[model samples]
Target: AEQVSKQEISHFKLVKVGTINVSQSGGQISSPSDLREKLSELADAKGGKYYHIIAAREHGPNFEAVAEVYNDATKLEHHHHHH
Candidate 1:
């Protein structure tokens, strides 16, 4: 799984399956770096190829956040001008 920022998502046709709640209570989740890595696994479990993190920060001495998972299979699917 990969992480996509809001700035570069313009070229992506992401289909968000749902929101995944990420909680890191132990093992020293020191920074956003670790959170990014962990979010990868969470997205993997969601059967998606990419995840967009909406928010993340310290929550009561732990890490907690919500990320949107997506399905990746872009094969020229058109959604406009179908007449």
Candidate 2:
């Protein structure tokens, strides 16, 4: 089994349509399960209704995981109604 340690994720930034800014470092996520759990935690903390992996690439012993955060469509609708 592969083990991962020293995980860290940066702050989320709204940058584009269906896209967000994130930079992760200091970990080797050696399993799909580990990545899934990490992403789930990120989504919850970021208030994302859904999350998707946009990109991933190795950088030495560490790695980067760029993800998309989708908010609830209903919330967007409500927001538009108030505008």
Candidate 1 global lDDT: 0.73
Give one digit per residue, the lDDT tens place, for model 1 in 1-83. 77787655557677776677777785756766777777777877767778888877667867777888877664354677777
lDDT of 2 at 67: 67
Each model's RMSD to truth, in Å? 7.2, 10.9
lDDT over C-alpha atoms for residue 53 of model 2 = 74
Highest-TM-score candidate: 1
**Model 1 lDDT at residue 41:** 79
Query: Which digits, one per residue and each the tens of the lDDT, describe model 2 over residues 9-39?
Result: 1233232224443445554376767677776
Task: Tell me the deviation in Å of residue 19 in model 1.
Answer: 1.7
- Using lDDT as the measure, the top candidate is 1
- Give candidate 1 misplaced runs (Cα > 4 Å): 26-28, 73-83
